[PDB]
Structure formats: C-alpha cells, structure tokens
Design a binder for this molecule. Structure first.
Ligand SMILES: NC[C@H]1O[C@H](O[C@H]2[C@H](O)[C@@H](O[C@H]3O[C@H](CO)[C@@H](O)[C@H](N)[C@H]3O)[C@H](N)C[C@@H]2N)[C@H](N)C[C@@H]1O
Ligand SMILES: [Mg+2]
Length: 268
C-alpha cells in the first residue's frame, strides 16, 4: 500500500521534525518505497512537517554541470566553451545522482535556487532567499555558502535511507579544517550575468576527497568516514520514513565533530 502524505508526516514528527525546523534532506526513494502520488508526496510531507515557518534546503546541483569537462583546465576547452548552456537557475534541472527528489523540490512553487551551478542549493520557506544567496564560485560548501548559513540556522540533516557518504554539510568541515595537504580543484562554469553567458573559472576545495587518502574514486571519502564514526558515537533519533531507515542529525554538531576529527588525524 503506497505511503500517504499523512502517514509520512506522522513518521517525520515521530523522528523529531518540528514545526519551524530548518531541514536538509538526503533521500533514497528506493528505500522509501511506493508513495501515493510519487515523490511529490514526500516533498509535500516534508513541507507540512516543517510548517509555514519552517525551511527546507537541498543540494540539487545541475544535471548538465560541465565539471568533468572543465576540471583541471585554466579555461573551458574551446568546444565546451562555445556550446555549453549557461546555467539558468529557473530552468536548469537538478542532478539525478544526488537524489531524484531534488527535481521535485527545485520545481516547487516559491522555491529559491542558488547561483553556483555545480553546488546549486534549493530552498523553500520564509528564509529561502537568505539561505540561497550569496553563493559564489570559490565558495561551494564552505564559509559564505548556503551550507554555512544552514549551520548558523539550527539546521537538521534528515537522512531518509541515505548512506553516511550523503552528508553534504560535512564538506564545510573539510573547507575549514586546519590540516596540511588539502586538495583543491579548478573548474569552469557558465553563468548568466545581465542576460549573457559568462564563463567563470575558479578553484575550490576538492569535494571528492579533501586529502589524497580520501580521494579514491569509490571511497570511502572523509565525509563517509566522519559520518560513520559520528553515528557510532552519538545519540541520534532513528526511525522509519516510508520504508526507509531514517535519522535526524544536528548539523552544527556533526560539522563540529568533523572539524575535530580531521584536525586530530592530520598535522596542521
Ligand atoms: N568522493 C566519494 C563520493 O562521491 C560522490 O559524492 C560527491 C560528488 O562526487 C561531488 O560532485 C562533484 O564531482 C562529481 C564527479 O566528478 C561531479 O559529477 C559533480 N558535478 C561535482 O559536483 C559533490 N560535490 C560532493 C559529493 N560528496 C558520491 N555521491 C558519494 C561518495 O562518497
Ligand atoms: Mg523563521
């Protein structure tokens, strides 16, 4: 029997989501199982659970981000540069690999979208505009990003069947960790500025592993290692949402733990 919105809302309440909360979801729709009206049922349930004063923030990215195609170059390669679509926050689809729910979130009426094409974040609620801007190239997940503001806004990370690798906020810990050997990447994104496409090349922390030992293609990366340790060490509300084992994590606490975890293991 497909899960109804009301059932999901009651499950979210049982897990500890309260009216007014600031929630960042990471969802495995396969784990959740069939929904009465598809993924929108869970989006609607999340919005109802946080209520009209609550907020949702999601890391949605962009289906067509030219990350791999520009990585490591000081400028976009010529063929990429000529024909790639500029990122248009109103129309650019979300990246499927971070969750199929994200396209439903980003298309929800009133959703706001951040300007960073690769790190794009979507937000719903009264504080959405404050969450999503600024979001500048060179500030993907660290200071001055939407994640930074989420962490200052009592954020909760709602993992619905997602693994420990899924915790985007822990890229903030990587950004600020006082450790030697941190990896950086250079890439280029096509932005709209006053209606025109402008290529911007930037560097930022490597979000595929902050040190060499965390940068294997298949992992585990530092986010996964930190989150697994944290979850083995901390009381965290656990329970079902749909068919999915879910957890509700204090974001500031896990990020503080992650900064300490990295700094304990790696010389300054
Ligand atoms: N390195 C291992 C991890 O790789 C992925 O996550 C990571 C993604 O690969 C990162 O994505 C970035 O790198 C990928 C891969 O090149 C690009 O497709 C993407 N546009 C770009 O944003 C994203 N910015 C952060 C995320 N933690 C897996 N989802 C989880 C895994 O633990
Ligand atoms: Mg408020």
């Amino acid at each position: 029997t497909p899960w109804s919105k009301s059932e999901l809302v009651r499950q979210l309440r049982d897990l500890g989501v309260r009216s007014g909360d600031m929630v960042m979801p990471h969802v495995s729709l396969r784990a959740v199982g069939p929904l009465a009206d598809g993924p929108q049922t869970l989006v609607d349930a999340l919005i109802e659970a946080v209520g009209p004063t609550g907020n949702i923030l999601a890391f949605v990215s962009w289906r067509d981000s030219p990350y791999e195609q520009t990585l490591g170059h000081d400028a976009p390669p010529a063929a990429i540069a000529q024909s790639w679509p500029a990122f248009d926050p109103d129309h650019a689809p979300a990246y499927p690999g971070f969750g199929a729910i994200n396209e439903f979130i980003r298309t929800y009426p009133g959703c706001r979208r951040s300007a960073h094409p690769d790190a794009s974040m979507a937000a719903i609620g009264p504080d959405a505009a404050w969450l999503v801007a600024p979001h500048e190239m060179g500030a993907a997940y660290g200071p001055r990003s939407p994640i930074a503001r989420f962490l200052a806004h009592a954020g909760k990370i709602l993992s619905i069947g997602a693994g420990p690798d899924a915790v985007t906020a822990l890229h903030y810990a990587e950004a600020v960790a006082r450790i030697e050997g941190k990896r950086r990447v250079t890439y280029s994104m096509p932005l709209l500025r006053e209606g025109k496409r402008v290529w911007v090349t930037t560097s930022d922390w490597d979000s595929n592993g902050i040190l060499d030992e965390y940068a294997a293609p298949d992992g585990p990366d530092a986010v996964e290692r930190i989150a697994r340790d944290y979850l083995a060490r901390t009381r965290v509300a656990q329970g079902p949402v749909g068919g999915a084992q879910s957890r509700l994590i204090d974001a500031a606490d896990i990020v503080s733990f992650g900064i300490e975890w990295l700094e304990a293991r790696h010389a300054a």
